[PDB]
Amino acid sequence: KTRAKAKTRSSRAGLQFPVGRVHRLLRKGNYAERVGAGAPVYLAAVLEYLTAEILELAGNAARDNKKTRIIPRHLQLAVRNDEELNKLLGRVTIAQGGVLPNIQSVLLPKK
Amino acid sequence: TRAKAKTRSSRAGLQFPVGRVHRLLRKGNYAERVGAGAPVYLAAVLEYLTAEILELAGNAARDNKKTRIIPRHLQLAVRNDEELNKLLGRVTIAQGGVLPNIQSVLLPK
Amino acid sequence: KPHRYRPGTVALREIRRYQKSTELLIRKLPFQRLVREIAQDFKTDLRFQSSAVMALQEASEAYLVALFEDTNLCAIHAKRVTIMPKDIQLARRIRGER
Amino acid sequence: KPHRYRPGTVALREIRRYQKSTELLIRKLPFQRLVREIAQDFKTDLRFQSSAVMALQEASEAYLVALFEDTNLCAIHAKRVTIMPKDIQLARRIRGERA
Amino acid sequence: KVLRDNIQGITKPAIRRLARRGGVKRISGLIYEETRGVLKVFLENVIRDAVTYTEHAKRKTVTAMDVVYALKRQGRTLYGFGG
Amino acid sequence: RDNIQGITKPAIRRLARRGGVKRISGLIYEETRGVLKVFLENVIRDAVTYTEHAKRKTVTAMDVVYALKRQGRTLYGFGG
Amino acid sequence: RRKTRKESYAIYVYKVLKQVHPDTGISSKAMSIMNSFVNDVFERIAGEASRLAHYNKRSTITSREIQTAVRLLLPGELAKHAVSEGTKAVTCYTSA
Amino acid sequence: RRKTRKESYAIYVYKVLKQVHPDTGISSKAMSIMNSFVNDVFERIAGEASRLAHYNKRSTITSREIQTAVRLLLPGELAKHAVSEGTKAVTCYTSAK
Amino acid sequence: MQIFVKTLTGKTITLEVEPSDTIENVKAKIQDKEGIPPDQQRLIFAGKQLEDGRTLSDYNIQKESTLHLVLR
DNA sequence: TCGGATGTATATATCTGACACGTGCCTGGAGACTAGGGAGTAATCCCCTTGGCGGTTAAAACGCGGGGGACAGCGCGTACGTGCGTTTAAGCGGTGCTAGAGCTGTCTACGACCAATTGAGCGGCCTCGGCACCGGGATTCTCGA
DNA sequence: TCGAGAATCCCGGTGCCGAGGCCGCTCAATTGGTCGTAGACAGCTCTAGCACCGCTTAAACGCACGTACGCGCTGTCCCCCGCGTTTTAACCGCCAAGGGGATTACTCCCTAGTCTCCAGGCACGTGTCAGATATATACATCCGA
């Protein structure tokens, strides 16, 4: 009767996001009567993938401007320049973001 | 012995089922517990809205010398009132149609 | 000698006539064939209920009518009577679609 | 003779300068006072957290910038360069906001 | 049976009738192709969503409820067909 | 209390310049002021309703985010 | 070999219609449209009430949540009249 | 002094960032924005899954509902990649014990 | 030098390697002392995937370094 | 500015298919009782909001010269509206047939719930390096001749 | 076409404050075990979706003709733009006071759950009349002399 050493559920799935916290939030969120044993793994994997994509693009954009930290402008530049992510966050405004540097062609000086 | 049963809608003086609304609230996965006053409020609000729309539609139909109500009358009643149009701004009604308006520029001289 | 109306009268007549009625405008069978051909690309050997086709036709007709109204407004804004493709493009761009 | 630029160059310079950066554009105190005056009607003796005022300012600025972009497109469509109130009205009507 | 070239079934007079109901008075000669493309895109999106919905239920027949749900999910809900 | 006049003409000019406008007519300012007033009234009404239901006396930053999210205008970075 | 039971709102809509206009009928499609309208509105109000209750760290929904959700959803005059009707109905039910 | 504990996805976001870019920092505002983004996506997916389960008169949320909701919300390429990642994670969790 | 390679099961093995030694030499020694085929060895040190064409000095893998191994 | 020709509105018979209504019944709602935790209320602490005063400095406000842009007017020719004869396939009415939606048993694997416990995650402190700021020079633009 | 002024960028030096990391500990995720039912699979029944064939006629198609509208071009007048001078209030720093938000403990009562009983809402079947068609006639409107 010796209990085995504890292993986090995220460790078995080879993930980084917490499986147990997601499971608790699903159970306490008033979504359904009962929750299966596989949904938290799927949700954690999806969230991790999306976070990794966003962070990679933002880091590339920050490295472009010779900076070692990420600020909201870098996140805005990363999001707005990818059509897929721009379509995802269509109706979301980011604080301290700014706009893309574009100008209409006709307004340019003649000659 | 036991006393005779009286429906809760009769006690509240309504025409919509209070018990059915209570059951739908309980089984709809909205909250852990449901109070005893929400169904009455919900039924009253729904009855008021239904009565308003039905009155407007009946008036519109009677303007067209008809005895029954068809979807065109409902569309005319909804689109010709401000607040009702605002409430249903993203809803399309089957067999409805449109409102008879023409831009003034296209009219002949 | 033959009686001919001036250009524009018949257009207004049809405008009034088709704004007074509520029946469908597109034919049924070609629309059903189009729907089946489009749906063939996602899963083969599919079957449809008639009410589904009717609902699709109603929604598409309403969408097209609203788009044409917006296009007419855009065309009128620029001192014109005739609608042109750039009006449709501008309306779609402003509405928030890609 | 004093050195003067032709009309239009400074406008493009201002466009580049203000669209490169990411600061706010409206003075804080007048906006806070306006928010307080507007909210006074709905309920008397209210109080505000500073972050709420900041959020309101950010949202308003974003909305105005987007509206101006759409208005500029509408103006350009009609073979012009200067925006006019009718352009704002047309953009608001098409967007579905104005009834 | 595999069916090809049904987009041309939307004849020019049908588009003209739709425009007349919309309030248009004069029509240019290049509108029809643009209208056909727009309609094709719209149908593609709605049909994709409905087919996904009917796939989840392990069925093989698309019902009206799937179309209603797919239309609602895009914020253009439809009344008069159940639900 | 004519505090709507605090939105000076140069501020509107700066906003338009960021938007991408090159020439501005002399009657834009009134329209801009009216539009901003309407938007602020709607948002503040919703936020005050939320605060009143919460049974408090000072509006928080959270109910502003909630009111904005209700109108399909989600905002990021303010404790959402 | 009979079918299963399908619940609906037809009887109550007919009762209200006969209360308002005593000499007017209604066809089937209009009844379906009204049924859809009732279901839609019920869903919106219930969802808003649930979110409001979750926001304030509560585990129940009472008349106050419904009243606030109604005030949030509907425009001005409709909100005022509906609030008055709901309050009157609740008071009349409690008194009996 | 008594302080209530607040939960956030800050540590996991930092772990992912250090996994992708070995040498790059992040400020507090960016962390708050990422926390809000994660919460928003979680809420959307969970609500879609709940509605989808309720449509088919069932009482359980399983991986199939999550997969269908993900395919419904995300566009094409993102949906494909997310589906692959979720399937791989679930298989790895099941095979091990 | 001596380096540490930690497997997926929580076991750390010691490799008597050199900075000039390629990652393929590390894989060969790991296979010799544990039986893990080089093609099934997935390696990270300092957040960099280890490539057989590169050496231990390329990844700045020095003595007493900690390396993570996956056999999936 | 009149008058002929065309399309639309108005009045009457008539026949059919959908609406309104009467039954049977069976499942869902109502009456009576218990028990147990969620929510209302009182008391306390201290943190954050509001208010006032001085300076200082950058931004707001006002006036003027002028050049480019909005707008009206004119001419042309070309694409689109209208009408007629010809060709095509949509629409309606039947008749067959079977794939698949829908309902009933059953039986087992999976999720909820509970007690002990122990390692992950959050609050507090600090320390030092990345980024902000100022001064200077090289560079890249624009406008008059 | 070419050169004289302004605005912008790259480089170097200096200083500050917040981001990355370490400790301590308390509450939530793990582990082991029991029990009840949600749903997966098999079987059967009946409907409605698919396919074919014939006929009728309304709608789509193609062609000819004329005209009105889209578009380029020119001239005028005036109204925003760039620049200089004067005025003001925003902003930063500091100092005081207190109201309302955030916890903590205690207690009554409001709701979930169970059993028993009966009546209201739904599926089914039927009659009859509101309105959709067909026919004829009166009236409003458009375009040429």
Residue numbers in the entry:
A (entry chain C): 9 to 119
B (entry chain G): 10 to 118
C (entry chain A): 37 to 134
D (entry chain E): 37 to 135
E (entry chain B): 20 to 102
F (entry chain F): 23 to 102
G (entry chain H): 26 to 121
H (entry chain D): 26 to 122
Give verbatim lines from the article.
The nucleosome is the fundamental organizational unit of chromatin and comprises two copies each of histones H2A, H2B, H3, and H4 wrapped by ∼147 base pairs (bp) of DNA. The nucleosome contains a conserved cluster of negatively charged residues in histones H2A and H2B, known as the nucleosome acidic patch, that is a hotspot for interactions with proteins that regulate transcription, the cell cycle, and the DNA damage response. Monoubiquitination of histones H2B-K120 (H2BK120ub) and H2A-K119 (H2AK119ub) play opposing roles in transcription regulation and chromatin compaction. Our results suggest a mechanism by which H2BK120ub serves as a gatekeeper to the acidic patch and point to distinct roles for histone H2AK119 and H2BK120 ubiquitination in regulating protein binding to nucleosomes.
To investigate whether H2BK120ub adopts positions that could interfere with the binding of proteins that interact with the nucleosome acidic patch, we determined cryoEM structures of nucleosome core particles containing Widom 601 DNA (147 bp) and ubiquitinated histone H2B-K120. The density maps revealed four distinct positions of ubiquitin on the nucleosome surface, denoted H2Bub positions 1, 2, 3, and 4. In H2Bub position 1, ubiquitin sits nearest the center of the histone octamer core, and progressively further away in positions 2–4. The global resolution estimates for the EM maps for H2Bub positions 1, 2, 3, and 4 were calculated to be 3.32, 3.33, 3.34, and 3.36 Å, respectively. The local resolution of the nucleosome core, at ∼3 Å, was higher than that of the conjugated ubiquitin, at ∼6 Å, indicating greater conformational heterogeneity of the ubiquitin compared to the nucleosome core. The secondary structure elements of ubiquitin in H2Bub positions 1–3 were sufficiently resolved to unambiguously position and orient the ubiquitin within the electron density maps. In all three positions, the ubiquitin beta sheet is oriented towards the nucleosome surface, while the alpha helix faces away. Given its proximity to the other positions, we modeled the ubiquitin in H2Bub position 4 in a similar orientation relative to the nucleosome surface. To visualize representative structures in the MD simulation, we used K-means clustering of ubiquitin throughout the trajectory to obtain representative snapshots consistent with H2Bub positions 3, 4, and 5. Although our MD simulations were able to recapitulate H2Bub positions 3, 4, and 5 observed in our cryoEM maps, we did not capture positions 1, 2, and 6, suggesting that further sampling is required to observe them.
